[PDB]
């Protein structure tokens, strides 16, 4: 379902072929309960070659 | 099955792989490091020079090295640089011999 | 186009799995259960023996 719009200026650009200043986190999945109660499939973004 | 033949004669222990026109050398962490734009590998070696004359009694490595360094020097460096001293030999990790 | 077709095939297999995992009696049992839960304790007292 739809929610809202964003400007191209609202997201940081990984401009140069090398840059080290990114401040990432160790992401922790908050899995939905339906994955266990009714064997539903979890999203994983677009398909890479592997 | 196969046709039999006697064992063939011996050959030089090492073969020339690359002639590098420009190679930078630096000292770090008690070791030498070598690098060039021609090849993406970085060679690492101990600070002590290897005594090539103890093993290359046939001069099969030594003669070829001298000739190559002179060809390269005459082609590109003779008009803009000078030789600092005599050649040096080093055994790099992975089993390579470098003449510098 | 390749990834578009791969996602179309895994949708077809999911529809096949849905058909073989389920069975015709599920609709009947659901229809009966929906009737019995509508009259409380008496509904359960009859529904448990009917099932």
């Amino acid at each position: 379902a739809y929610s809202h719009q964003l400007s191209r200026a609202d997201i940081t650009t990984v401009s140069t072929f090398i840059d080290l200043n990114i401040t990432m986190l160790e992401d922790h999945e908050f899995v939905p309960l339906e994955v266990y109660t009714r064997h539903e499939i979890k999203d994983s973004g677009l398909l890479d070659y592997t | 099955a196969w046709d039999w033949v006697p064992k063939r004669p011996s050959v030089c222990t090492m073969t020339k792989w690359q002639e590098v026109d420009e190679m930078l050398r630096s000292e770090y962490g008690g070791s030498f490091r070598f690098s060039s734009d021609a090849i993406c590998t970085t060679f690492t070696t101990n600070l002590t020079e290897y005594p090539l004359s103890r093993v290359d009694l046939g001069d099969c490595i030594g003669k070829d090295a001298r000739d190559a360094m002179d060809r390269i020097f005459a082609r590109r460096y003779n008009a803009t640089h000078i030789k600092v001293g005599q050649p040096q030999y080093y055994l790099a990790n992975g089993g390579f011999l470098i003449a510098y | 186009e390749v990834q578009r077709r791969v996602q179309l095939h895994d949708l077809r297999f999911a529809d096949i799995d849905t058909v073989i995992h389920a069975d015709a009696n599920a609709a009947m049992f659901a229809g009966l259960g929906a009737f019995f839960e509508g009259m409380g304790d008496l509904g359960r007292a009859v529904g448990k023996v009917v099932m």
Binding site: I11, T13, F30, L33 | D56 | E37, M51
Partner: protein, 112 residues
């Protein structure tokens, strides 16, 4: 004599037979808390357009967002409900209901 060739084989073998290793990595899937965008191609001119061309040195500054990282703790309770009165062999036809709810402060301090 072959003695020099033989010891050179030994030195070359020892230099490559040495131990070497690298670590393994566990890569947890990203949740979307940090996202980035990429650059795009530009309409390149066919011939020179501009006036007053000149050369120079430059330094580029960007706005300082000053990120602040810290540690936090979450608390919640998962709940599931199903009509088991139909019997374990038939209850699945009636389905399951489920929810996720917050934990009150009293339970966090007095029990957890």
């Amino acid at each position: 004599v072959a003695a020099g060739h033989a010891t050179l084989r030994e030195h070359l073998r020892d230099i490559k037979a040495e131990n070497t290793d690298a670590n393994f990595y566990v890569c947890p899937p990203p949740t979307g808390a940090t996202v980035v965008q990429f650059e795009q191609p530009r309409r390149c001119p066919t011939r020179p357009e501009g006036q007053n061309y000149t050369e120079g040195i430059a330094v580029v500054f960007k706005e300082n967002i000053a990120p602040y990282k810290f540690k936090a703790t979450m608390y919640y309770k998962d709940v599931t409900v199903s009509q088991v009165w139909f019997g374990h062999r038939y209850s699945q036809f009636m389905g399951i209901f489920e929810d996720r709810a917050p934990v009150p402060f009293e339970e966090v301090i007095d029990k957890i």
